[PDB]
Write a protein that binds this ligand. Structure first.
Ligand code: GNP
Ligand code: MG
Length: 178
């Protein structure tokens, strides 16, 4: 007794997102910007895997985003095949001022191709677009790469908020439209 509150399962409209990319590209700062609207100049390298839950509204419906942050440093990784296979969508992050991080994208895509399902949603993010001064990866170059791999592409800055919400909502929409 007494009043029924109609409820569904714990995992109803819970979308699982995975952030992958080289160390230093800004995966953790992107997540912190999106979830807390906060930022740090500090480079505190992520150990293993961790998640945050961000609740958003899409087309008048509330969906929970379970976003997994990952170690970019190999010596700190715990990520296992199931993390790829258990994700609805994967965001690959590079740093537009770091050619090596962008070269690493092909290898990250091959990790997804190895361990994720053929149908996993993908999004390419070139971070640190606030560093216009230090850009080494041209938009048109990354865009052509993304196009050839049939995935959307956004440039972002965790520092000044540019496209951050858009990146995560883009992926959320990709999963919801699925
Ligand atoms: N200018 C600028 N710096 C950024 C941006 N995003 C992150 N950084 C900086 O770049 C460094 C690395 O950020 P971090 O979020 O830790 O990257 P990460 O990919 O999570 N690293 P790891 O894989 O090792 O955990 C930090 O010094 C951070 O302040 C951005 O958009 N612009
Ligand atoms: Mg990190």
């Amino acid at each position: 007794h007494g009043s029924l509150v109609p409820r569904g399962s714990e995992y109803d409209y819970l979308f699982k997102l995975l952030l992958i990319g080289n160390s230093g590209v800004g995966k953790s700062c992107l997540l912190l910007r999106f979830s807390d609207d906060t930022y740090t100049n500090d480079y505190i390298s992520t150990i293993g895997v961790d998640f945050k839950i961000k609740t958003v509204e899409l087309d008048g419906k509330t969906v929970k985003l379970q976003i997994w942050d990952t170690a970019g440093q190999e010596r700190f990784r715990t990520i296992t095949s199931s993390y790829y296979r258990g994700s609805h969508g994967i965001i690959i992050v590079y740093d537009v001022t770091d050619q090596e991080s962008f070269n690493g994208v092909k290898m990250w895509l091959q990790e997804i191709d190895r361990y994720a399902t053929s149908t996993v949603l993908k999004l390419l993010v070139g971070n640190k677009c606030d560093l216009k001064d230090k850009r080494v990866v041209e938009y048109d170059v990354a865009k052509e790469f993304a196009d050839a791999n049939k995935m959307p592409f956004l440039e972002t800055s965790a520092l000044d908020s540019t496209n951050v919400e858009d990146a995560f909502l883009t992926m959320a929409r990709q999963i919801k439209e699925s």
